[PDB]
Amino acid sequence: EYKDTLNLNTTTFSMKGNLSVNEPKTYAKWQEQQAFKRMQARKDNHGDFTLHDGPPYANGHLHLGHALNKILKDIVVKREYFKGKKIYYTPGWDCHGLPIEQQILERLEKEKTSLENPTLFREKCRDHAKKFLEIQKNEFLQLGVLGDFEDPYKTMDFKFEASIYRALVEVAKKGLLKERHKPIYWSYACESALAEAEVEYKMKKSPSIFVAFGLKKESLEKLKVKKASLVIWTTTPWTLYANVAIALKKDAVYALTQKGYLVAKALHEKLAALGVVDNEITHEFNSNDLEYLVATNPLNQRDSLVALGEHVGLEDGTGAVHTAPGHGEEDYYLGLRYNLEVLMSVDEKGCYDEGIIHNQLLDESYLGEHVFKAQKRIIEQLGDSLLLEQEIEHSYPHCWRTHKPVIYRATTQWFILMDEPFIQNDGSQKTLREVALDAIEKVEFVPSSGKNRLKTMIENRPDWCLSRQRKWGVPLAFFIDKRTNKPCFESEVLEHVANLFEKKGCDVWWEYSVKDLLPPSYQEDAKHYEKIMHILDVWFDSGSTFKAVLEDYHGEKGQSPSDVILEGSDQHRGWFQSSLLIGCVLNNQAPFKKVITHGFIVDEKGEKMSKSKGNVVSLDKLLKTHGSDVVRLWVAFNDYQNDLRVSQTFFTQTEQHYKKFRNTLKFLLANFSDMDLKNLERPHNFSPLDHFMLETLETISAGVNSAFEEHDFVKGLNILMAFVTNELSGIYLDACKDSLYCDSKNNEKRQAIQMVLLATASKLCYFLAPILTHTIEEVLEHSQALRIFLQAKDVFDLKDISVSEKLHLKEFKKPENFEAVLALRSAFNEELDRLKKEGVIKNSLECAIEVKEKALDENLVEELLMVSFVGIAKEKLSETPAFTLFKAPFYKCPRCWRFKSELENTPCKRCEQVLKER
Numbered sequence: 001e002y003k004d005t006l007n008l009n010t011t012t013f014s015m016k017g018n019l020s021v022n023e024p025k026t027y028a029k030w031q032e033q034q035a036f037k038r039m040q041a042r043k044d045n046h047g048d049f050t051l052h053d054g055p056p057y058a059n060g061h062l063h064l065g066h067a068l069n070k071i072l073k074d075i076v077v078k079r080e081y082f083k084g085k086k087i088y089y090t091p092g093w094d095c096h097g098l099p100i101e102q103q104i105l106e107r108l109e110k111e112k113t114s115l116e117n118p119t120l121f122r123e124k125c126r127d128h129a130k131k132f133l134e135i136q137k138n139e140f141l142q143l144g145v146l147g148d149f150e151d152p153y154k155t156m157d158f159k160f161e162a163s164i165y166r167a168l169v170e171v172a173k174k175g176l177l178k179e180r181h182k183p184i185y186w187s188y189a190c191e192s193a194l195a196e197a198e199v200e201y202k203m204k205k206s207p208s209i210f211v212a213f214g215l216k217k218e219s220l221e222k223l224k225v226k227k228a229s230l231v232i233w234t235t236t237p238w239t240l241y242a243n244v245a246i247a248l249k250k251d252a253v254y255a256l257t258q259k260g261y262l263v264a265k266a267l268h269e270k271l272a273a274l275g276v277v278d279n280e281i282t283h284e285f286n287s288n289d290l291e292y293l294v295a296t297n298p299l300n301q302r303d304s305l306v307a308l309g310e311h312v313g314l315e316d317g318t319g320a321v322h323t324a325p326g327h328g329e330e331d332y333y334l335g336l337r338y339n340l341e342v343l344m345s346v347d348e349k350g351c352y353d354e355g356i357i358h359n360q361l362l363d364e365s366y367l368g369e370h371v372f373k374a375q376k377r378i379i380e381q382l383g384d385s386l387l388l389e390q391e392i393e394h395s396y397p398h399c400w401r402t403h404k405p406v407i408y409r410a411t412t413q414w415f416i417l418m419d420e421p422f423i424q425n426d427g428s429q430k431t432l433r434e435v436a437l438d439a440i441e442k443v444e445f446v447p448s449s450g451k452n453r454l455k456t457m458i459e460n461r462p463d464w465c466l467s468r469q470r471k472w473g474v475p476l477a478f479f480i481d482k483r484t485n486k487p488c489f490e491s492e493v494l495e496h497v498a499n500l501f502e503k504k505g506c507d508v509w510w511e512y513s514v515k516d517l518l519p520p521s522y523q524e525d526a527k528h529y530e531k532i533m534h535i536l537d538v539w540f541d542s543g544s545t546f547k548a549v550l551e552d553y554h555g556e557k558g559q560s561p562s563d564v565i566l567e568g569s570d571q572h573r574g575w576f577q578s579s580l581l582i583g584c585v586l587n588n589q590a591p592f593k594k595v596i597t598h599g600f601i602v603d604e605k606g607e608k609m610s611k612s613k614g615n616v617v618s619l620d621k622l623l624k625t626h627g628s629d630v631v632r633l634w635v636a637f638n639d640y641q642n643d644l645r646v647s648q649t650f651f652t653q654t655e656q657h658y659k660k661f662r663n664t665l666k667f668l669l670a671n672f673s674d675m676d677l678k679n680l681e682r683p684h685n686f687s688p689l690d691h692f693m694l695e696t697l698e699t700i701s702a703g704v705n706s707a708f709e710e711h712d713f714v715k716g717l718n719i720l721m722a723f724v725t726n727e728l729s730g731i732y733l734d735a736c737k738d739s740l741y742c743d744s745k746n747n748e749k750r751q752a753i754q755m756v757l758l759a760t761a762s763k764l765c766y767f768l769a770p771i772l773t774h775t776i777e778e779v780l781e782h783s784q785a786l787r788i789f790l791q792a793k794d795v796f797d798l799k800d801i802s803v804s805e806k807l808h809l810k811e812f813k814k815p816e817n818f819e820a821v822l823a824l825r826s827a828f829n830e831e832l833d834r835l836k837k838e839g840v841i842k843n844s845l846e847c848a849i850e851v852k853e854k855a856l857d858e859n860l861v862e863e864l865l866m867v868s869f870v871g872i873a874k875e876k877l878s879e880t881p882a883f884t885l886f887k888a889p890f891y892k893c894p895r896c897w898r899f900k901s902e903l904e905n906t907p908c909k910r911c912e913q914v915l916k917e918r
């Protein structure tokens with residue numbers, strides 16, 4: 001046996017990753033040695049890159065969605081660092097708001113107690129966010145991500161709360177913060193106003209009723225008919241107490257039925273078929289002639305003005321809209337257009353209050369009843385004025401944290417105005433809506449489709465309600481001047497409060513008196529001021545991160561505008577939008593240059609992950625099972641810009657991708673492990689096959705890099721895998737196995753192959769470093785030849801090398817053209833397959849080939865096809881137009897197993913020299 005006499009060609013780099021054991025040691029090392037602060041400190045940094053982290057809410061353990069987010073940021077940041085740039089990536093945490101406070105509220109009820117005290121209540125919220133900020137930081141680090149995680153930004157930091165307030169101050173001083181009174185989203189479960197980003201639309205069952213409002217005697221007499229009752233359709237009988245008007249479409253025909261029901265003519269066929277009204281039409285009237293008629297509410301006998309709405313629809317309902325200014329936005333403006341009462345007797349908990357008694361809007365038995373529980377009895381009380389009751393299902397707004405359905409209540413709140421012109425920094429005049437639309441156009445969106453998703457929301461969004469009635473957050477810390485009943489926006493007062501917030505935090509706004517919150521110039525008039533006690537929308541907190549992080553640290557944590565932000569698709573409704581609006585107020589532009597949007601983590605069915613249905617695949621279990629580098633590769637190897645379905649069969653296919661990458665690196669390290677390192681200093685004479693591989697390596701390297709530049713990691717990884725699978729393993733390593741294992745260690749041709757393998761292993765390490773960082777760190781740990789070839793202590797010294805300069809290749813060396821011999825190789829391998837089907841021969845080495853086109857260099861044909869002989873022989877095997885196969889007229893060599901030995905069981909001529917070399 002000659003197996004002892006072959007080159008060993010082994011490496012300590014193991015085949016099995018054993019990731020759940022080795023990865024924790026790597027990530028713990030990067031924290032001990034401060035790898036990120038070392039990345040920033042790299043002395044040859046050239047250029048700058050800023051990724052501004054969007055702060056996840058400081059609540060709960062991380063799920064797979066958080067991991068997808070951070071891993072994608074980690075790939076983008078590591079890509080820029082390995083391109084040679086100074087990077088800025090300070091992660092942050094969203095600590096205020098209902099995402100944290102609602103958990104305190106739910107914990108207190110399960111604990112059977114409560115908490116009136118403001119300071120102590122904010123403390124338990126603050127401690128909850130601190131506890132889960134630290135839990136999430138360590139779970140992020142167990143994914144291999146690198147950022148300033150030991151110095152993250154926190155909205156609960158005193159300096160940060162002061163930065164948020166100073167951002168609000170800028171909004172106020174530009175004339176965009178104004179009080180408004182109108183119906184808005186109201187969550188009775190937390191007794192607070194809401195805006196769109198705090199609202200979740202989902203399907204809900206609801207009553208759907210058609211109600212008859214009889215015309216009063218004088219209106220019947222003015223219309224000259226015996227009976228007439230306008231029919232309204234509504235899904236909210238809880239608002240009927242607050243009716244003041246019935247709205248019709250302007251200049252539209254309304255049909256009067258023989259039973260005396262008045263509806264829009266365009267809808268009579270639907271309503272008659274529904275059995276709401278009868279089928280016979282006696283008269284038709286124009287809605288213009290019906291305006292200012294008066295009807296009688298059948299619920300409380302109150303008057304109802306027949307009015308004309310701006311856009312009454314004739315596709316649904318009846319063409320007659322029950323109008324309640326207290327509980328509808330378009331209802332409110334119509335009530336003001338006709339100067340009607342704003343009836344609103346629903347308190348902050350969604351229950352009828354004493355206003356129904358004083359204004360006789362509803363029977364006293366409804367006092368204290370919740371509006372949704374009272375609807376069954378209201379419908380019964382409608383009597384025979386109820387023409388038809390159905391139950392339907394419609395999309396309905398719910399509170400994002402209490403998950404209860406919201407209502408609308410006419411209330412006075414604070415708003416950022418969208419269509420109010422304000423003075424631009426360049427001296428011009430524009431509305432916030434116009435500025436945001438122009439700022440969107442300067443932002444690159446990845447994918448491009450996310451642009452008009454944000455553009456559409458900006459085109460249609462209303463004024464932004466900022467004021468909330470909760471405790472955990474940054475207060476709208478302004479004083480109302482009782483003398484003028486306006487807010488005080490004088491700079492000395494606002495900066496005095498801001499300085500106090502910066503040193504002490506926002507707790508002082510609840511604790512201190514009015515005079516102690518006022519500057520010295522103002523205490524003599526302390527009696528004339530009252531504190532606003534609303535807190536800011538938590539989406540204003542996160543929308544201000546660019547100012548608190550990028551601007552207030554003067555580029556020490558990144559430049560404003562940032563180069564890249566990267567969040568999930570639900571952030572067009574949220575952080576993307578709130579940051580755009582706040583950035584457009586302060587700087588008149590978006591605080592980001594590029595938006596990368598990724599999809600959501602969904603189950604095997606494509607359904608949303610819920611902590612209830614159990615479709616949640618826990619991140620911890622996923623990491624223990626597959627390892628972080630496989631989860632990272634699963635992210636990069638999949639269509640992250642769309643939703644990602646989680647199934648263990650998809651991670652198995654990813655492990656096969658990781659095994660293939662890892663097995664390839666093990667072969668490379670094993671087959672240049674014995675190369676004398678003074679080979680690195682001298683130029684080599686590379687073969688045609690060597691140059692084909694070096695030129696192919698250069699071609700796919702440009703493709704992988706160009707794809708990774710566009711963040712299309714699937715495309716680049718496919719180019720990498722196909723190269724690894726076809727050109728590298730299938731062709732090159734197959735043809736070099738004889739020289740690597742059977743030629744002398746001193747053979748210049750074997751040494752040249754090892755340089756090619758060394759170059760290939762360098763390129764794979766560079767391109768895989770941002771994705772499989774622990775694995776590439778492991779590779780460099782096990783190869784002294786790789787560490788000296790790349791001049792790298794570890795993975796963080798990786799640079800994109802020039803293969804030409806480090807291998808001393810000639811300029812204007814004409815590229816190889818293997819289009820002919822590779823097609824002959826394909827044709828031979830097909831014919832070789834069928835000869836093995838018959839069982840004639842077992843290997844390519846048993847064959848001799850005579851090619852009919854002598855243009856093909858003989859020894860390259862022998863190398864690529866791994867025939868033992870090129871030319872004529874005795875025993876024909878089969879023939880094609882291109883070649884003839886013969887049985888190799890030699891014995892199999894006992895050492896290299898090639899058919900090149902002239903005598904049985906005797907080493908071939910090459911192996912004899914090697915076996916006796918001194």
Ligand SMILES: CC(C)[C@H](N)C(=O)OP(=O)(O)OC[C@H]1O[C@@H](n2cnc3c(N)ncnc32)[C@H](O)[C@@H]1O
Nearest residue numbers: 054055056057065069094542567568575599600601
């Ligand atoms: C200021 C913002 C960031 C706000 N604090 C917030 O929403 O913070 P939040 O903690 O809710 O999320 C923070 C980030 O995680 C992503 N995200 C959440 N659920 C996901 C899911 N099922 N699949 C994939 N990504 C998911 C989400 O888009 C965001 O980029």
Ligand SMILES: [Zn+2]
Nearest residue numbers: 893896908911
């Ligand atoms: Zn041999």
